Amino acid sequence: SLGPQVAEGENVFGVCHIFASFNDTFVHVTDLSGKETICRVTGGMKVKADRDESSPYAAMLAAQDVAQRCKELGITALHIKLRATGGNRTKTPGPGAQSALRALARSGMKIGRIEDVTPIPSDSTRRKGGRRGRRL
Amino acid sequence: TSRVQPIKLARVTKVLGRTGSQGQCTQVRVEFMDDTSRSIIRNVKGPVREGDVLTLLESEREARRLR
Amino acid sequence: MRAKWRKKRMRRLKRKRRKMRQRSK
Amino acid sequence: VVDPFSKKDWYDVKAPAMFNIRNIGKTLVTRTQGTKIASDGLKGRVFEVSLADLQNDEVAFRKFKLITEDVQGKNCLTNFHGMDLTRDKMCSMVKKWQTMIEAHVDVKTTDGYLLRLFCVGFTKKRNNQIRKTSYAQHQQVRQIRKKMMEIMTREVQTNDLKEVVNKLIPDSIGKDIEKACQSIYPLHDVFVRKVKMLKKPKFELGKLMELHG
Amino acid sequence: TKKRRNNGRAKKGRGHVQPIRCTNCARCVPKDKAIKKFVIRNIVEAAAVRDISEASVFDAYVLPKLYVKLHYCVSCAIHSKVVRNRSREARKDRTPPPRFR
RNA sequence: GCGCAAGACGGACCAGAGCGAAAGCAUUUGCCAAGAAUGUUUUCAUUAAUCAAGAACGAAAGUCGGAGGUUCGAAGACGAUCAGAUACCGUCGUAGUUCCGACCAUAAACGAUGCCGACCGGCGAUGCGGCGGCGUUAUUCCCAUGACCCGCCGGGCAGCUUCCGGGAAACCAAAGUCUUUGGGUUCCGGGGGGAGUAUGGUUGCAAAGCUGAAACUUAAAGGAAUUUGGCGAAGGGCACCACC
Ligand SMILES: [Zn+2]
């Protein structure tokens, strides 16, 4: 439940999977292997209102929650894995991922590699909607 | 929240345009007399003359244009 | 109209007329 | 009801003598509880490490796959599993008004390990170039692809993994590609996309022991 | 009235091209007809670049970018105001606008 | 995060680029067959152009019979919308969508322009083959080729400008060479509705395809463009009878 390595000599590393869509955000933190995790949090964990799921506020509250959990457990540094909606839907990251990164960096933890693990396809199946699309 | 911010001062240099839906906030670029190398962009409501001094609560956050 | 739905209604009328013609036999 | 973090260990991972930096971080596991084995739970853990985190200040847009096999207590030993490229780098290669040459091969080393290598190629826009397009003919692209495939099926089977991945570190296979392909059409940017491990033989402890040391 | 010299696309010697899908909607548009934006962007736009610079173990760490292209139907492009309309006499200007920043 | 299985598709490279009679065509590799252009002091010597009847191919949807059905999604089911929506929206979802056969021959199948031949401007570019001409590179010597530069030829997708000329004008290097009217030749239109309708023949298991009137009614229906207009179109300015 603690890191036996001294903090001054070395710092420990985990990774985080910042998945942000147009209606939700996730902050999921695990180690380099990624098989087992530290803690998880969604965009609806800290706000009961559904309308406020896609916002900077739920992202920064989630980042503060995992910040407190990683401070109390003993994980000091984190690698970045940003994720958009992915697949064939949307290749653009959500408007809460940057605020989540800002909240997770302003709380005094060290960062590592910043890499996009957005699931880009070669060619997927047909997109949702009609031939004329989602018109409104 | 457990967040404490130090008191920050300001010093206006050159006037700029005005933002807001009704033009009540005025852009102005400032310098810090405490550390004369950092300059940030902020909005001020009220009359502003060049050569005046502004009071703040924190100087680490910037504001957007409209929304 | 637009000619697509006018043609569709005319073809439905043709099918109705052919139904009545084959029923009248 | 109770925190599972009380039933939690802290093991270390080590690189073989094939690499330079030995340890890279920590892992998390519980102790054994009868039908649960702590040695099994450390088996299927693929790692995602950078090249500059394993060597000195070299290029840092390459990723290496490391898979664990065996533990002895408070420490673990890994092995090579594959190669990856940074998506920032790979997405920065592809620009308009040049042709892409991509190849693959199924080539087997001296031992039972089998690799599927990839290559990608982007052509020279010349120093004295005025013409916008600078494309290549299809037979030229075909024979450059044949040249890349025959080079990377020349390099691999003559040795084993312990030295061909040492060749795979700086640029050497891509160096051979970019040095043996000026004759057909000049090309400027070739690296190795990925190495996808396909088949592994029965596991012996001795080979894992001699790589680590 | 023939509005343009071409017909809103670059189809001059084929007759049929491959259709693709938009991003804001799913409208099937031909590839040479659509308005495509190959946008270039960074991970941190303008806010936390100093935050990333100070709080990094790697000294003077270079920030990565993100590469993405979007496909637009004409209604979705004008609704997003990417492209606007002008006079027919000034419609014959194929040059892109001068990018300053 | 690791393995397994299924079907669909070949992103980025991907273009006012290429090929094909047209529909249409994109992972790599192998096999079979075909073709334009180019080069030619090779061959036959008018074998040619357009073409009723007849014939081949033919987007999507549709029908019959097997296999497969990942995703999508007509019919239909459920909640919110508005005065009302069995519409838009979201979750599901049958038939189809995929492959092998068997069929109708219908698209804004459009460059809304049939083919062959000849003539009359300029300019910069791109693709193919051939031909030259300072120079750089696969290291230096050195030739042949690939790569790059500067010119040419012939054909093709195209582009900019033009008081040649034309047109109702948009615009056209063809829609030009037309009262100064004739190069050769297939299809097709005579105000708008009725109406691509009735009937008859024809083809098809069927959806329907081809051929196709009349009675009656009507003085307008149409194409190009200027001038104010009306935008829940974009882009500027002003007003305490607009506001902070
Ligand atoms: Zn769209």
Q: What residue of A is the nearest CA neighbor of E63?
A: A114
- Please state, in angstroms and rounded to a whole number, the distance separating the CA atoms of residues A105 and E54: 10
Helices (H) and strands (E) in chain C, counts: 1, 0
Burial of D127 (0-12, 13-18, 19+ CB in 10 A): exposed
Residue A90 gets which letter from DSSP?
A: B
Which superfamily is assigned to B5-66 in CATH? Nucleic acid-binding proteins (2.40.50.140)
3-class SS at D4? helix
Residue pairs spanning A and D at CB distance below 8 A: 45
Residue B9 gets which letter from DSSP?
A: B
- Please state, in angstroms and rounded to a whole number, the distance separating the CA atoms of residues E70 and D65: 32
For D169, the token pair is: 């570190």
Name the domain count of chain D. Answer: 1
| Backbone phi, psi, residue A81, to 5° | -130, 90
Is residue D70 in a domain? yes
D186 touches strand F (CB under 7 A): yes
Task: Estimate to the nearest angstrom the gap between the alpha carbon of E33 and the chain centroid.
Answer: 13
B24 touches strand F (CB under 7 A): yes
Element (H, E) at D74: none
Terminal CA-to-CA distance of chain D, rounded, Å? 45
Across the interface, whether the CB atoms of A31 and D26 are under 8 A apart is answered: yes
Range of D79's domain? Answer: 6-213
- Please state, in angstroms and rounded to a whole number, the distance separating the CA atoms of residues D61 and B39: 35
Residue written as tokens 């969604």? A42
Residues A106/A67, Cβ–Cβ less than 8 Å: no
Resolution of this entry in Å? 4.2
Q: Partners of D67 in the beta sheet?
A: D46, D79
Q: Which residues of E touch A11 (CB under 8 A)?
A: 57
Burial of A65 (0-12, 13-18, 19+ CB in 10 A): middle
Range of E33's domain? Answer: 1-101
Method used to solve the structure: cryo-EM
Residue written as tokens 């290559």? D119
> Which residue ranges make up each domain of chain B?
5-66
What crossing angle do the helices spanning D161-168 and D172-179 adopt, rounded to 10°? 60
Within an 8 Å CB–CB cutoff, is residue E65 touching chain D?
yes
Is residue D1 in a domain? no
CA distances from A33 to D46, D62, D151, D164, E57 (A): 6, 17, 34, 25, 21
| Backbone phi, psi, residue B7, to 5° | -75, 130
CB atoms within 10 A of CB D123: 22
For E22, the token pair is: 């938009």
3-class SS at C6? helix
Q: Which residues of D touch E64 (CB under 8 A)?
A: 86, 88
Name the domain count of chain E. Answer: 1
